[PDB]
Amino acid sequence: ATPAGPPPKNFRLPPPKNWDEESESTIDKVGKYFLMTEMLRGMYVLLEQFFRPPYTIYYPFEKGPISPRFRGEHALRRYPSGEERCIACKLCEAVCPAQAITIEAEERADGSRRTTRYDIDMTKCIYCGFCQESCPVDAIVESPNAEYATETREELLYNKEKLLANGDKWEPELAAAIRADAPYR
Amino acid sequence: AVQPTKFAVTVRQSRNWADAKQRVIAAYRAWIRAAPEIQTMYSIPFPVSHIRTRIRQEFERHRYVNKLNVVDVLLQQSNADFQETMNFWRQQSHVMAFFKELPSNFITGFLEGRN
Amino acid sequence: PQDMPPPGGYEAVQYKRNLPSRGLFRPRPLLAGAAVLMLYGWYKLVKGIREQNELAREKM
Amino acid sequence: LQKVEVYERIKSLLAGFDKVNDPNNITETAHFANDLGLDSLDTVEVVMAIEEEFSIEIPDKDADQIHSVDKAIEYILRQPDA
Amino acid sequence: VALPKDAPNPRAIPREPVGEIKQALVNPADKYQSKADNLHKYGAWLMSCLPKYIQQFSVWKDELTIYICPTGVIPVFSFLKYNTNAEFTQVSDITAVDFPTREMRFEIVYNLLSVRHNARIRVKTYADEVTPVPSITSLYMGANWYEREVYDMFGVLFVGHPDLRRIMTDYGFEGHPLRKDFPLTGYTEIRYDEEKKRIVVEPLELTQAFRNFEGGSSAWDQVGPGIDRTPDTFKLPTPKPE
Amino acid sequence: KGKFLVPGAPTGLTGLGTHPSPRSALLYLYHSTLEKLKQIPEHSVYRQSVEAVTRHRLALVESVVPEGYDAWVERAKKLLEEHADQFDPTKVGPEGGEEVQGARAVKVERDGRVFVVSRLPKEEDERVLEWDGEVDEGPELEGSRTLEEKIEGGLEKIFTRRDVKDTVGRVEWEPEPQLTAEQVAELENKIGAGLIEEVIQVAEGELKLVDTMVKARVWEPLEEQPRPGQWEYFERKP
Amino acid sequence: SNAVSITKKYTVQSTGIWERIRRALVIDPNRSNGVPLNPYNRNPSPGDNPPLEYTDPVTIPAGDIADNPYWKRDFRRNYPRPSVIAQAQQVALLSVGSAAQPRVELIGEEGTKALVAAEEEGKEKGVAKYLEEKGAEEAKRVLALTGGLPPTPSGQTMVTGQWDVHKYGLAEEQSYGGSYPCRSFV
Numbered sequence A: 001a002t003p004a005g006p007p008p009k010n011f012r013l014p015p016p017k018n019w020d021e022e023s024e025s026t027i028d029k030v031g032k033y034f035l036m037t038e039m040l041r042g043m044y045v046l047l048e049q050f051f052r053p054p055y056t057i058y059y060p061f062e063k064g065p066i067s068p069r070f071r072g073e074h075a076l077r078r079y080p081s082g083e084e085r086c087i088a089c090k091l092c093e094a095v096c097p098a099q100a101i102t103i104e105a106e107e108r109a110d111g112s113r114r115t116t117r118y119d120i121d122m123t124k125c126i127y128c129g130f131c132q133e134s135c136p137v138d139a140i141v142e143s144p145n146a147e148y149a150t151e152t153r154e155e156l157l158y159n160k161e162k163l164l165a166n167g168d169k170w171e172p173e174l175a176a177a178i179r180a181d182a183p184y185r
Numbered sequence B: 001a002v003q004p005t006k007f008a009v010t011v012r013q014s015r016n017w018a019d020a021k022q023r024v025i026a027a028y029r030a031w032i033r034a035a036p037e038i039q040t041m042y043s044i045p046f047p048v049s050h051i052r053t054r055i056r057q058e059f060e061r062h063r064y065v066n067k068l069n070v071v072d073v074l075l076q077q078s079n080a081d082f083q084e085t086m087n088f089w090r091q092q093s094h095v096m097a098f099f100k101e102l103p104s105n106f107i108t109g110f111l112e113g114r115n
Numbered sequence C: 001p002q003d004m005p006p007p008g009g010y011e012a013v014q015y016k017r018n019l020p021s022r023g024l025f026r027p028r029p030l031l032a033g034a035a036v037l038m039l040y041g042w043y044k045l046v047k048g049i050r051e052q053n054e055l056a057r058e059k060m
Numbered sequence D: 001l002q003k004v005e006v007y008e009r010i011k012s013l014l015a016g017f018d019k020v021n022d023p024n025n026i027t028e029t030a031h032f033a034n035d036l037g038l039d040s041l042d043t044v045e046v047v048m049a050i051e052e053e054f055s056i057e058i059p060d061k062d063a064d065q066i067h068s069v070d071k072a073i074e075y076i077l078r079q080p081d082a
Numbered sequence E: 001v002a003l004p005k006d007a008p009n010p011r012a013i014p015r016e017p018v019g020e021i022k023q024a025l026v027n028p029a030d031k032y033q034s035k036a037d038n039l040h041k042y043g044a045w046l047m048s049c050l051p052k053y054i055q056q057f058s059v060w061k062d063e064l065t066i067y068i069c070p071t072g073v074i075p076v077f078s079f080l081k082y083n084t085n086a087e088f089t090q091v092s093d094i095t096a097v098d099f100p101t102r103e104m105r106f107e108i109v110y111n112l113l114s115v116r117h118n119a120r121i122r123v124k125t126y127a128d129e130v131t132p133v134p135s136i137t138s139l140y141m142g143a144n145w146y147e148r149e150v151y152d153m154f155g156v157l158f159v160g161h162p163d164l165r166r167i168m169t170d171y172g173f174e175g176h177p178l179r180k181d182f183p184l185t186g187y188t189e190i191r192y193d194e195e196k197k198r199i200v201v202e203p204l205e206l207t208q209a210f211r212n213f214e215g216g217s218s219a220w221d222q223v224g225p226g227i228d229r230t231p232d233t234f235k236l237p238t239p240k241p242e
Numbered sequence F: 001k002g003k004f005l006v007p008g009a010p011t012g013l014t015g016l017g018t019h020p021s022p023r024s025a026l027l028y029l030y031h032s033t034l035e036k037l038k039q040i041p042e043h044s045v046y047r048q049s050v051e052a053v054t055r056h057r058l059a060l061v062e063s064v065v066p067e068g069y070d071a072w073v074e075r076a077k078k079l080l081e082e083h084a085d086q087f088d089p090t091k092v093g094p095e096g097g098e099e100v101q102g103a104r105a106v107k108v109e110r111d112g113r114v115f116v117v118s119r120l121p122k123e124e125d126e127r128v129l130e131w132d133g134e135v136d137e138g139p140e141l142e143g144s145r146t147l148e149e150k151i152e153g154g155l156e157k158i159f160t161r162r163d164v165k166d167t168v169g170r171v172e173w174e175p176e177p178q179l180t181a182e183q184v185a186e187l188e189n190k191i192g193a194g195l196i197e198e199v200i201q202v203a204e205g206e207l208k209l210v211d212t213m214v215k216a217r218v219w220e221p222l223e224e225q226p227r228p229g230q231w232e233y234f235e236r237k238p
Numbered sequence G: 001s002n003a004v005s006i007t008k009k010y011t012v013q014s015t016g017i018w019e020r021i022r023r024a025l026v027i028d029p030n031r032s033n034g035v036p037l038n039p040y041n042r043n044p045s046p047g048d049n050p051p052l053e054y055t056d057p058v059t060i061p062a063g064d065i066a067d068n069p070y071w072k073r074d075f076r077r078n079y080p081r082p083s084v085i086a087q088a089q090q091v092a093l094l095s096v097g098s099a100a101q102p103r104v105e106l107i108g109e110e111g112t113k114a115l116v117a118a119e120e121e122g123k124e125k126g127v128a129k130y131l132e133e134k135g136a137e138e139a140k141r142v143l144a145l146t147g148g149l150p151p152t153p154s155g156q157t158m159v160t161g162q163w164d165v166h167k168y169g170l171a172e173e174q175s176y177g178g179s180y181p182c183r184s185f186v
């Protein structure tokens, strides 16, 4: 048990106190017993909570606070010209810890290295952000969006058509989050 | 320490082949004695004859073992499978997963795809 | 710059146990005030029952 | 119980068992292995069947001793249940 | 907002600037040499008190490992529980590691603590799919569930163990999933069946097969051999010239 | 009042109480251990280690003598030598006697040192103590009984057991002077293994370890050489 | 009491009569209500913190452009190897000593042939056999390797400059006083 070496000073407890050694008055001890004193204090503490402002917010009219680093649903992003930023390096497919990303690429009609397939199984994803961490060109990002609950699981299998549409819709926040969070990356 | 459960048996090695011989009979007896009790615990709709048939076949697959240290692993597994069954830790789906209610020729296998 | 503490450091916080005994919950005043309520209540009760027994005499 | 009563039911059970070589070989002094052609597991089933019919429990020590019909009869008389 | 009278805005306080940052380089292994000699003597001392069972010992940084043969599990752990200089009264942990290249596949690794001496020690023994290991449940009540995990995950019997049964896997489960030859996703999977109105078991099919990216491992060795850090007191002497 | 530790008072470690007699107990435990090692060959490092540690700690416990020990030990010799029959384990049993509701004591030898272990009857309140604390063996056998049943009853105990109040041929053993709570700390500052109650439990586990080492024969040559490749890992050639 | 004032506690305050009322009717008027300050808490939001302000930090040696080859900081590839001692060369270390404490001189040639024998005798006969024939005084020299007593196992603190047992002591201030069964240690 205790450390080797000299035993801790005063580690041995003092000898037990007898009933007639407890220095509490009978009037106090009996009063506390019969008057339920300590539990009246607890009742009172609830009373002053009753007259304190509540903590509650009125979701969805009010929303709790989220940061620029918040990790929500995925979106594929474009350059200011409308060209896709994704170049099919496959780094995010490799680093994924849950194997939720499946990518197929080719040379495009104009000789460009672009994806032909881009799927995220949103029921396999763990929402860690490792895929946006690894992107060389800021293509895959996680939006600040958390409200995208669906009726079926097929609605959670995102193809490139769904992910580009997400970036096309959410670009103003995705840009404002990257702006606010880039220097720390 | 914590109490071993109702059918918990201490893990001990077989002394000789006579020891193993007597333990295997004890385990087979204890299983087929319990088949009526398994049927009403797990609401088996088959009769107890089928349940005891399956117990016999499980023992028969280890029939031709001539190694004490393989038998004792096997006597361990049956002890845990017996204890697990009698205390009703497993459920009906597990007990029915145990009852199954490959192509028989090359040509049959070939024509359907491999099997 | 990175997120640093202020020059002299932050001022101390309150962490030591703080449950100070309040006179509202002491077993002497509560027992005493209970005895005053309980003795006054029996005083009014003696007046009440004495009057009701007299009210009963008139009704009979 | 009665000796003839505790033997007649055994013959019906033993003949009722599916794969004995022949129902004639069952006698009062017949052996399961040498005569009735029952291996280890078949013999354990036979003592199990005998115990269920007589509504008695046969312990591990004396269950092994029953390798012949006569031994089953003597144990049934020895144990006081029916 | 009713602000408190003595709580200023803390962001509104100016931070003094910090410029050039100096940072010394440190080998984190250098702090462990001041007890290298001591960890080798303790490991050597055990080797001498119990030479029937202790095969070798190794010292890495602050961890001392003791290698023993399986027939000595009880006496060695009895010595480490009850000796005055070996008051190792907890088993922190008991796990196994599978080495299929070794005949004895399984390495049984126990971890002990000595709060009296603020000391830790590792003991390693070996078993295979048929060799059992002596249980230590008679010396360490807390070892009951660890040995059950080794038996469940790897399939190692622990002779003397009371109530040795599965602790991690599903009830009817067959196989030892921490074995290297056990496939990652197993052999079976379950579903609720509409025709049978129950959970049923089926051979494992996968809508998307697991993609093993292990073939992307480096063609070049990235760590090298390391360094030797054995103290002079546990090296043999060198014949001086002439 | 505060001169002596109170036996069974909690020590601050749960389930660990104050030892009624810590000094003698360590000597008993140490001498008992120094006796069991003698069935180990002298070339065993295990023997030399335990033999070294125990003697080092033994001389420290001897160094702390309770007050008046010399006077009591001179008295207590004149009791054991005059009335050796009373305290003889071969005569009164290893438990000191059969009457637990009175005082009991035997004389024990370790290494040649002489120990007297006493069992004062358990201190319980008067109002929940039946027959002075006598042992209840149940009702005497009455009615028609066979001789064997009367034998199994305990019929030979009429002629050997004692009325506790019958004390003429016996002497009341006064036990050893104890260590004043200052000395207990002073002794445990020397030993340096925590409280003396902790030191005692480590000593008694040390006593039981010797029997396991002796049986296993831990000092004999290695049983199983590790086979080739057994302790190989993933090391890179130096 | 060990209470700090409510006026330093960064929560929304009562004011005026309701401050007077609340200090009259609470158990501790220095306890806070737990409601943070809108001007101070998380203001500005991290999403409007200027990016130019934060600077990613580089240390002088590691990040310098002219005073660090990588190989003098490549501490990962300078990793320690495990140091493994077997019975075959524990008998050896007992036979002839060690580069620190040699037993005999081993001068020049004719000492090497003794050096291999110390290793060879370890591989032919182990530690138990070695102590058998040298007798009990070799076993006594084993304890001499640690000064006569068996070695103590090494502690894991080094907060005092040497690897030791941490010395737990009773804290100067006991938060539950003595009233409650929880004691405070340092």
Ligand SMILES: *P(=O)(O)OCC(C)(C)[C@H](O)C(=O)NCCC(=O)NCCSC(=O)CCCCCCCCCCCCC
Binding pocket: B021, B024, B025, B031, B038, B054, B055, B058, B059, B060, B062, B063, B064, B065, B071, B074, B075, B077, B078, B081, B085, B095, B098, D039, D040, D041
């Ligand atoms: P006779 O001399 O012929 O003796 C027959 C035996 C079987 C003893 C053999 O001669 C023999 O010695 N062979 C080797 C031992 C052997 O057959 N196997 C080892 C025994 S363990 C074993 O076989 C376990 C089988 C599986 C578990 C028990 C069966 C019940 C499973 C579950 C039933 C239903 C649950 C829902």
Ligand code: SF4
Binding pocket: A085, A086, A087, A088, A089, A090, A091, A092, A093, A103, A134, A135, A136, A137, A139, A140
């Ligand atoms: S890491 Fe980014 S750029 Fe590269 S393939 Fe994946 S999404 Fe495209």
Ligand code: SF4
Binding pocket: A092, A095, A096, A097, A098, A099, A100, A101, A120, A124, A125, A126, A127, A128, A129, A130, A131, A132
């Ligand atoms: S955030 Fe999702 S998609 Fe990206 S790496 Fe993690 S699990 Fe995969």
